[PDB]
Amino acid sequence: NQALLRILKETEFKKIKVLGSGAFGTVYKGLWIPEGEKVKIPVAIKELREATSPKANKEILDEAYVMASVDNPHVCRLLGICLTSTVQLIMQLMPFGCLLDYVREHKDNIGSQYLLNWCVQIAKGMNYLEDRRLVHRDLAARNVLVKTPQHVKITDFGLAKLLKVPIKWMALESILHRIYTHQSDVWSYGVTVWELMTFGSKPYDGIPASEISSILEKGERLPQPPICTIDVYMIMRKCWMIDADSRPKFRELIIEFSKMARDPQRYLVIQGDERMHLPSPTDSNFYRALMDEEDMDDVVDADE
Numbered sequence: 285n286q287a288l289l290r291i292l293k294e295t296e297f298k299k300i301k302v303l304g305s306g307a308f309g310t311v312y313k314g315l316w317i318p319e320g321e322k323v324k325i326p327v328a329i330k331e332l333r334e335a336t337s338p339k340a341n342k343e344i345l346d347e348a349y350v351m352a353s354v355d356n357p358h359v360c361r362l363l364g365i366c367l368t369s370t371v372q373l374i375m376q377l378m379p380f381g382c383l384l385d386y387v388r389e390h391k392d393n394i395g396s397q398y399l400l401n402w403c404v405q406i407a408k409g410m411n412y413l414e415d416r417r418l419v420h421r422d423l424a425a426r427n428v429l430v431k432t433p434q435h436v437k438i439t440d441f442g443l444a445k446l447l448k449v450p451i452k453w454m455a456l457e458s459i460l461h462r463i464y465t466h467q468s469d470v471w472s473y474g475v476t477v478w479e480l481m482t483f484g485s486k487p488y489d490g491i492p493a494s495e496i497s498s499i500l501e502k503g504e505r506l507p508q509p510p511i512c513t514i515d516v517y518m519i520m521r522k523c524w525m526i527d528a529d530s531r532p533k534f535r536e537l538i539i540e541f542s543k544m545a546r547d548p549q550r551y552l553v554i555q556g557d558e559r560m561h562l563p564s565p566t567d568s569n570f571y572r573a574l575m576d577e578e579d580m581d582d583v584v585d586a587d588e
């Protein structure tokens with residue numbers, strides 16, 4: 285459906301401030317000014333680095349329709365595009381930013397219920413992509429956004445194909461053979477889970493990217509995060525098995541983390557955890573009305 289992708293003119297929006305960047309481009313907070321109206325509506329804008337040829341223009345556009353068709357509570361939808369000298373991609377602006385920064389800025393003031401729910405929600409978004417027969421290729425905590433603390437959304441879907449290789453996130457077959465599959469996405473999911481559980485540690489810190497295939501081939505893996513019980517760590521290790529088909533499926537990952545979320549303290553050990561709990565319904569309802577009206581599945585709660 286082509287109607288899911290608004291074609292914007294450079295006159296209808298402005299970039300206002302830089303929010304971050306990646307291998308792809310620079311992300312700005314922007315203002316959309318509609319249609320002979322006064323108002324300025326905040327948006328997020330990724331401007332791609334290399335200038336766009338017209339012929340590739342069709343190629344980018346074809347991919348953009350797919351990106352705009354992504355409809356799930358846990359994956360960010362591409363809203364609009366502007367094609368010029370540059371390709372500009374328009375999406376919802378999220379006051380809370382990316383998950384990687386969030387867990388860093390809240391290090392150790394985050395409860396087992398939040399961490400285990402995020403893991404569930406990430407697995408639900410990835411599962412949806414798999415169901416659409418789509419592969420992300422660049423899952424990482426930096427590409428998951430926080431809509432509210434209770435609701436996270438994978439972003440950056442589809443550009444990796446569309447146009448700095450994240451070797452430390454990559455399944456070994458992707459490093460060696462540039463093969464990308466749902467099962468390599470599962471590998472990067474394991475790394476993403478590891479970033480959350482360490483409150484945003486850098487994976488294989490201090491180790492050159494060039495050495496990573498060798499240490500993987502030797503059966504070395506990211507170390508067990510100190511808050512993680514063994515069952516949590518074994519799931520991560522399973523995500524990083526050499527045989528791609530031995531790795532869990534995202535549908536299994538949804539089930540396992542959901543079950544752990546029902547008994548959060550049995551699976552993560554966090555000091556002060558009883559002092560930390562999911563928002564009361566009162567606080568959840570207020571958040572939804574102010575900044576998260578979109579339909580979504582219930583967060584998994586503790587049985588007791």
Ligand SMILES: CN1CCN(c2ccc(Nc3ncc4nc(Nc5ccccc5)n(C5CCCC5)c4n3)cc2)CC1
Binds near residue numbers: 303378
């Ligand atoms: C000192 N910190 C102050 C606050 N800060 C910040 C950054 C971003 C947001 N929000 C926000 N929203 C939507 C985004 N959509 C993409 N990415 C994106 C990807 C593809 C197409 C369009 C946007 N981003 C990226 C991820 C984080 C940096 C910007 C987005 N970021 C809120 C606060 C970071 C610096």
